[PDB]
Ligand binder design. Sequence first.
Ligand SMILES: [Cu+2]
Ligand SMILES: [Cu+2]
Ligand SMILES: [Cu+2]
Lengths: 353, 373, 359
Amino acid sequence: NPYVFQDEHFESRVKTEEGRVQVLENFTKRSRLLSGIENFRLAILEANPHTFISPAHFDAELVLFVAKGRATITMVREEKRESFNVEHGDIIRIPAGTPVYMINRDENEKLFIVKILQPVSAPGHFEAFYGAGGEDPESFYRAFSWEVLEAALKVRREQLEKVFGEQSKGSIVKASREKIRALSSGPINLLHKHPSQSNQFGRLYEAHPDDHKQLQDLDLMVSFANITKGSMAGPYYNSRATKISVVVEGEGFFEMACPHLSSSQKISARLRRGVVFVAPAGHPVAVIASQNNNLQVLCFEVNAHGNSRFPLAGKGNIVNEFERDAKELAFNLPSREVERIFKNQDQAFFFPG
Amino acid sequence: NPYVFQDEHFESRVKTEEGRVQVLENFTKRSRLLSGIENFRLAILEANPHTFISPAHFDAELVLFVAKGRATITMVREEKRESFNVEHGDIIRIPAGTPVYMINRDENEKLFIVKILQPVSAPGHFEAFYGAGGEDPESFYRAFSWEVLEAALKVRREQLEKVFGEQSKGSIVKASREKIRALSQHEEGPPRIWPFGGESSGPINLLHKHPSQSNQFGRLYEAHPDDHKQLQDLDLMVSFANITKGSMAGPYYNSRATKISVVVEGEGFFEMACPHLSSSSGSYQKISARLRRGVVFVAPAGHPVAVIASQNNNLQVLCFEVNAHGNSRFPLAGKGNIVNEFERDAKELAFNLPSREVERIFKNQDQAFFFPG
Amino acid sequence: NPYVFQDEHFESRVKTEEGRVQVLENFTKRSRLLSGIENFRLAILEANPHTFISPAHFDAELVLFVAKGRATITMVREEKRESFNVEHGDIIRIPAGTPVYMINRDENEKLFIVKILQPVSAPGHFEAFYGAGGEDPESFYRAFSWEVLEAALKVRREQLEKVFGEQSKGSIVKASREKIRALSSGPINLLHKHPSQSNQFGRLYEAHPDDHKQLQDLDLMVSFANITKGSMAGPYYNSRATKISVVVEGEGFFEMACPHLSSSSGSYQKISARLRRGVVFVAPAGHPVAVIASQNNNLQVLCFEVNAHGNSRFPLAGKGNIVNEFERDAKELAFNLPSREVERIFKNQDQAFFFPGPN
Ligand SMILES: [Cu+2]
Ligand SMILES: [Cu+2]
Ligand SMILES: [Cu+2]
């Protein structure tokens, strides 16, 4: 299944006692079917309570989502140093090239953040540039000769070897109880918002780039779905956007029709927590949750401007909107004999499975 | 010829006794020379009179042009079905994912439509998503299992196996004379001024507007994305040229537009100057090709191109010009040609001849754009 | 070195005994590393005094910079014709497909022009279309049959062969005192701008697309850096722009921290090369780069910075050092050292952007 990514497709770039960062492989590596989203990479960051994430700037425009816990994200722009207080559900865009560090405020629960990066310059490949540490993460300063650093900073050579040539703990280190306290057009909370879809079978929260200028620069919509146990997300497809969905918590399963994979096309997966599945534009996809627990899934909708969700099944079903004569010629069956199939349901988007 | 595509370069994705849909191959497959229009695909739909095209949606932005016959195009859009009655020379913009169906409201004239597609995901590749059908066409509901479809629309399993197992004639099926009359009775859309321009959404009457270039030897109708809501999203200009028999569209080149020309009706030939391939700069290679109905030739930006019509009958070419904003159409011969505007002393040094030998070369054609052949 | 291009990477498309045009190869030819500037090409034009450059148009957007000499650029866009006299440090935008010829109106100085081209059709490739020429500047009219040219131009076949076959001297030809006749929005004199950064150790001129419209179409900033002898342009990185630097005059060297050529889990390869007149080096987005001038003479660098909108010059040393802005707590856990010890190494440089460096 080219449209499904489990744990074996990730690659840990950061691994410490107090934290880890997993980076998903390029979507154009396995198959060319995902020729789009080639300039998009997916990253997952988790950290222990009262820990510190070393500062670094990226070769990519960064948009992240706070999956669990609370945190303090500090961005360093031109002169101005912005610090923002975020919570579970907040969305922040980090502009490419700016330095950013963050901590885990909370005392007992962890901290999970889902990053999506659009590489500038070379597409599909991004790197983190570390300005601190000489062994644990080498400072790019160490890539310069000593004469250049001595001349630029006007500092003794042995003092440079001392400041950089220390720190071997992690790009995610632990913090003192006091240092966490001192550090604690802005962030956008997706959960604390009027749901675009509201019913007992599911709660859908989405932030479209027309509403918030933070997401307009990348033309990317972030949407979150809380599925009721046993319920399902009815079969539908996006007009123009390609859905990159990541499971935050829970189990279920999804199915999708792909005319590219057939013999002139059954595509499905089990869908557990920590699995990424890509739903391209125009592909009919349906998500069903197990009867035991919920299915909280985060979706990234690339190319969101002009998108229009078409439900294959529901109140606004795209088929029962046809003319009475067109339904007859299509199925080669009388009108009322096929008019009843799409008129039976009354719910919206979310259904029970 | 790297710029000429004939019948062997088309794929018949739809094959029915009442019509066919030939889809052109990707411009990259043969060579990387046409890499500028890699994310574009071509299609040609033919249909017998009084027929029905099954509803479907595409993973690509679609802009179709009616090159022969009349039809009724209906789109469902966002909770508001709209239908349009279009005839010869109408441009229709179908948003990506928007389902669409159409008929051939004529009694004896077959349909003939040219489609240009712009994929929104994987570049250069697209597929049609038929929602209704069993075998031909195949509905994507059959990819979902019976257990999921059961709890989707409150319908039993054995009741679904009867609906999705009936249609098998094809995507272009015959229709009774009243079903054609029902759809073609009323067109659904907000009031618009006529002829339909680009100030509001809906079809565009390309042949109902004054030509940008017009004389005895030919006429050129065009729709630029700058003043067209339907085309501005694509930065694609649609042009049509009715070259008189024995006449020619004189040598010219686009400043930044890449022309994807499709011959609708007539016979002729075209010549183009290409420095990119030239057998290693030995000399310009005379890229000539015979032109008939069904031949598609592409002229990349900056390339001088001339289209000559046969002496027998006119040559009528449909032009898809990608990257149209800021595009200037520079003529190399005739009235207002570009080489004439050079300073006199610059022509003496460029050609290495005195002014008496070169000046009246670009000053001795009273006509503009269209000339005798 | 994937980021450095010597004279062996250029290909001369024009070569006459009065001038030549060396065209840099594709940035994506050797490796897929410089994919961010795949749709950009570089070219250098040198011309003897009192010479003429044959007219032509390109299937590419053209932004040229005059590095040395006097000249005048003549363009013929929509019907009307414009002719601008340009000198040292002028920026001229040329729309794709608009013909352009020029001359070196100086009587002694050679005309040196640095071109950057953005192909408007097939990415990474372009060609020059000569209309008024003969054999060596081969006119594209020769690609059409004489029956077509005769009907469209209304000119006899014998005269067409006589005109489109005479010229064989090349694209750059000497012109004898007809210069005065061929020289009698708009250019941007970069050197006549106030430097964005200026001290004793260097001056930085720049023309951002947000302030000039002409560049706004390419999202391309043109920058110049006159670094004093022995001095250096301190380690910095562009937030978004990919810099394509060309050494106009002088000697020196540059260093860059590239984590893509690391060949390790999370390292930074040391990219370095000597700088001399004609060397082109590319500093991708986010890459810390430092340029150092030779101790004898100055080092003058012209920079084409693709993707300039929203770009910021983050300096890693000097007055506006980015690391100094960090909070004292953040400085400690990052270095695993006391906050008081790490501050001394980033506050010890008083100068901005330009510093000395001799060892
Ligand atoms: Cu597919
Ligand atoms: Cu060519
Ligand atoms: Cu690198």
